[PDB]
């Protein structure tokens, strides 16, 4: 259809509002004391939430720029959040700040490339100060501290991360179930976490995670692409007539299949799920093998010549539970033979005793790894049920703050690691004037956070930076008791992973944003 386009300083100006819109709808909930927002339903009910990325989510502006530019950030942002674990409103926060001195600076006539070549260099050595400035947090009373730090001074909650990660491993995945029980239950069980996601976002049946969860569902174990339904349809309705949901595993299920399978779900008929393999290549065939194998299935192989047609039930593998996000898709209790396991497990180390390149014993080692390690299933139990869905959502959220910490150590949090990284960096210069501009925006855009914070605390925001300036190591000022001191000692700790992340995708979306010459929207 006809589009209007926008050339130059209009269009910028106009992503400008956008993302301004976005970053005042988004940074109130920014900092302990964040103040809430309200988000109308088309139920009646609103809902008052103090959480980043519902507020994301839900803003969609009606101006097409500016409805693009809020829909790039959101994403950038989402992007973030879905990497580290948290830190979007932190994400948002900084495209804010940067985009805005970014256009100040190009409005004087700057050039937009310098100044995205500043930023790249003052946010690499940021990266660098934030490496440098890292706690590590190996350790298992590290781990403990953390756990508790994040579920709102937690033990209990600690020492069950530190109890599962020990058990598995630090890099073991790590699930969470509804327990029966009083008491908290940790069990391992055989499963698999690849880093592939659903392939329709409408498989979301849990939109509070932004997740999919099937309850003792079939695994099909296909090597052909899925194009068609006709093939699908008497596995489909087998499983149907079941009464069981289903999970597809192909290389990709595309076309009209694709669509037939969302126009299902919408419907509701029959709750099936979809993700594409993982990996490519004979990697390929020799996961979705141990998959069928650690499921109790039977690939269905049309090089071999079994048909889609033709499979049957028992063909299908059968797991207690599934998980599968955007990134990552994993598998709880795979029921199958033991004995095949280690028959795999065996088979899989001959291979790496007869590899030959240091890579492929790297690949054949983290396959081997994902088969032995299994996955540890956390069953969290409360004495009522509000109660325990409470605590079970406090325990992912420090699941996935420890994990983040684990992968990449802890920095001083409140934002004031940023702080830090500024003030250390004041120094730095680039090869143009325009450069240290763009390195001098990146400073106040990594100085902002922090201002945010405690305005919306509600003290002066010059003076508390300037006195966490003006402090050493990771001397700053809390929020919440308003006051100042180390954080590591008062606990205000966040993992340098979500920090490091989101000054990176800022970064990146400045600098899309700052580079921009045009933008093609549809007509009214």
């Given at each position: 259809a006809a589009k209007d386009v926008k050339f130059g300083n209009d269009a910028r100006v106009k992503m400008l509002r956008g993302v301004n819109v976005l970053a005042d709808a988004v940074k109130v909930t920014l900092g302990p004391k964040g103040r809430n927002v309200v988000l109308d339903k088309s139920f009646g009910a609103p809902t008052i939430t103090k959480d980043g990325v519902s507020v994301a989510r839900e803003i969609e502006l009606e101006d097409?720029?500016?409805?693009?530019?809020?829909?790039?950030?959101?994403?950038?942002?989402?992007?973030?959040?879905?990497?580290?674990?948290?830190?979007?409103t932190t994400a948002t926060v900084l495209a804010q700040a940067i985009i805005?001195?970014?256009?100040?600076?190009?409005?004087?006539?700057?050039?937009?490339?310098?100044?995205?070549?500043?930023?790249?260099?003052?946010?690499?050595?940021?990266?660098?100060?934030?490496?440098a400035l890292s706690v590590p947090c190996s350790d298992s009373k590290a781990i403990a501290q953390v756990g508790t730090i994040s579920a709102n001074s937690d033990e209990t909650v600690g020492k069950l991360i530190a109890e599962a990660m020990d058990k598995v491993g630090k890099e073991g995945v790590i699930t969470v179930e509804d327990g029966t029980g009083l008491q908290d239950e940790l069990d391992v069980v055989e499963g698999m976490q690849f880093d592939r996601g659903y392939?329709?976002?409408?498989?979301?049946?849990?939109?509070?995670?932004?997740?999919v969860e099937l309850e003792s569902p079939f695994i099909l174990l296909a090597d052909k692409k899925i194009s068609n339904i006709r093939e699908m349809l008497p596995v489909l309705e087998a499983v149907a007539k079941?009464?069981?949901?289903?999970?597809?595993?192909?290389?990709d299920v595309e076309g009209e299949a694709l669509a037939t399978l969302v126009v299902n779900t919408m419907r509701g008929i029959v709750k099936v799920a979809a993700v594409k393999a993982p990996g490519f290549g004979d990697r390929r065939?020799?996961?979705?093998?141990?998959?069928?194998?650690?499921?109790?299935?039977?690939?269905?192989?049309?090089?071999?010549?079994m048909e889609l047609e033709k499979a049957t039930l028992e063909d299908l593998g059968q797991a207690k539970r599934v998980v599968i996000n955007k990134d990552t898709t994993t598998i709880i209790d795979g029921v199958g033979?033991?004995?095949?396991?280690?028959?795999?497990?065996?088979?899989?180390?001959?291979?790496?005793?007869?590899?030959?390149?240091?890579?492929?014993?790297?690949?054949?080692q983290e396959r081997v790894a994902k088969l032995a390690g299994g996955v540890a299933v956390i069953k969290v139990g409360a004495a009522t049920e509000v109660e325990m869905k409470e605590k079970k959502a406090r325990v992912e959220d420090a699941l996935h703050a420890t994990?983040?910490?684990?992968?990449?150590?802890?920095?001083?949090?409140?934002?004031?690691?940023?702080?830090?990284?500024?003030?250390?960096?004041?120094?730095?210069?680039?090869?143009?004037?325009d450069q240290n501009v763009g390195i001098k925006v990146a400073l106040r855009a990594m100085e902002a956070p922090l201002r945010q914070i405690v305005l919306n605390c509600g003290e002066e925001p010059s003076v508390v930076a300037n006195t966490v300036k003006g402090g050493d190591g990771n001397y700053g000022?809390?929020?919440?008791?308003?006051?100042?001191?180390?954080?590591?000692?008062?606990?205000?700790?966040?993992?340098?992973?979500?920090?490091?992340?989101?000054?990176?995708?800022?970064?990146?979306?400045?600098?899309?944003?700052?580079?921009?010459?045009?933008?093609?929207?549809?007509?009214?």
């Open positions: 097409k720029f500016e409805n693009m530019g809020a829909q790039m950030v959101k994403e950038v942002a989402s992007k973030a959040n879905d990497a580290a674990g948290d830190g979007t805005t001195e970014g256009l100040k600076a190009v409005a004087a006539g700057m050039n937009p490339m310098d100044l995205k070549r500043g930023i790249d260099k003052a946010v690499t050595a940021a990266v660098e100060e934030l490496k392939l329709s976002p409408y498989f979301i049946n849990k939109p509070e995670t932004g997740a079941a009464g069981k949901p289903l999970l597809i595993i192909a290389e065939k020799a996961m979705l093998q141990d998959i069928a194998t650690l499921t109790g299935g039977t690939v269905i192989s049309e090089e071999i010549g033979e033991e004995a095949a396991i280690q028959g795999r497990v065996a088979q899989i180390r001959q291979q790496i005793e007869e590899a030959t390149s240091d890579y492929d014993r790297e690949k054949l994990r983040a910490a684990v992968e990449e150590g802890v920095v001083a949090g409140g934002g004031v690691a940023l702080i830090r990284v500024a003030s250390k960096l004041a120094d730095l210069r680039g090869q143009n004037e000022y809390n929020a919440a008791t308003e006051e100042y001191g180390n954080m590591i000692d008062m606990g205000i700790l966040d993992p340098t992973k979500v920090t490091r992340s989101a000054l990176q995708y800022a970064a990146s979306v400045a600098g899309l944003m700052i580079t921009t010459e045009c933008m093609v929207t549809d007509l009214p």
